[PDB]
């Protein structure tokens, strides 16, 4: 039976202690962008460099 879960303790050890991992996996060239960063939006400027 394949599962066979972990075993931890408060003082189990630094390696034995659980590093909560969040795998933020990004794809930057997958589709039109839907989520962006927190930047203030300025006024739109036309006909200028």
């Amino acid at each position: 039976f394949p599962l066979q879960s972990y075993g931890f303790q408060p003082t189990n050890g630094v390696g034995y202690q659980p590093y909560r991992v969040v795998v933020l996996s990004f794809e930057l060239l997958h589709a039109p962008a839907t989520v962006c960063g927190p930047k203030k939006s300025t006024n739109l400027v036309k006909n200028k460099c």
Partner: antibody
Framework: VQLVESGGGLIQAGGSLRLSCAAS????????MSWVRQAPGKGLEWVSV???????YYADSVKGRFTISRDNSKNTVFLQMNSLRAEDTAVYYC?????????????????????????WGQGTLVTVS | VLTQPASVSGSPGQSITFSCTGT?????????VSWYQQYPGKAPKLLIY???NRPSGVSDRFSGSKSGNTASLTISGLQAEDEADYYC??????????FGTGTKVTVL
Amino acid sequence: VQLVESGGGLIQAGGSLRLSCAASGFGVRNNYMSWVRQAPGKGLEWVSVIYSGGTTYYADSVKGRFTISRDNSKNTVFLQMNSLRAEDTAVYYCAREGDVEGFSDLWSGYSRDRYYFDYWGQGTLVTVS
Amino acid sequence: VLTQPASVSGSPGQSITFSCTGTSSDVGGYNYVSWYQQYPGKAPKLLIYDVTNRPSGVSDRFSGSKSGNTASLTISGLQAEDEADYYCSSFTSSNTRVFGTGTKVTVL
């Protein structure tokens, strides 16, 4: 590794019990969780074993009575005792089978078969009276 | 049920060979036999998983073996604390494990 046991007590014939075995340092999932009875001054006649998941393996002489389950939330293996008979009178051990990398033995890689026994608890006396 | 020799008494230092019988279903064919040691009241401790292999914390003089339907223990150099019954656990014989009766050793 520590194993604490409870549930045994003096009951009349045809009663019910609930054997509780809580494991600290390992779970009921890590290694095979066996049930053994050691009759006073006799051998240890194997009763049952709950593996890491989903087993109904029993001995030839105790078929169809013992029911084995776990509450994984509290890490407890339960042996619910119904329809006692004479031969079940013994001291009962919840046995931790030798987990993966048994005593860091330098030959066995992840073969969890390893049908031997690791350290156990203090044992519970289960008496039919 | 594997059969083992009964209670015996002896001298420290030399070798005692305890052979225990079995069936061809478990010992003769399969090779997952293990042996244990217990002190009355305390739970059994592992002596020889796989018989040939020896866990740590155990004196190296303990040695066991299997021959056909029989399993042999070649124990060497007895001492005072060694007086305890020796239990033979073979393979689970198509998922129903079996043991021997027990060999209670005595010393002077």
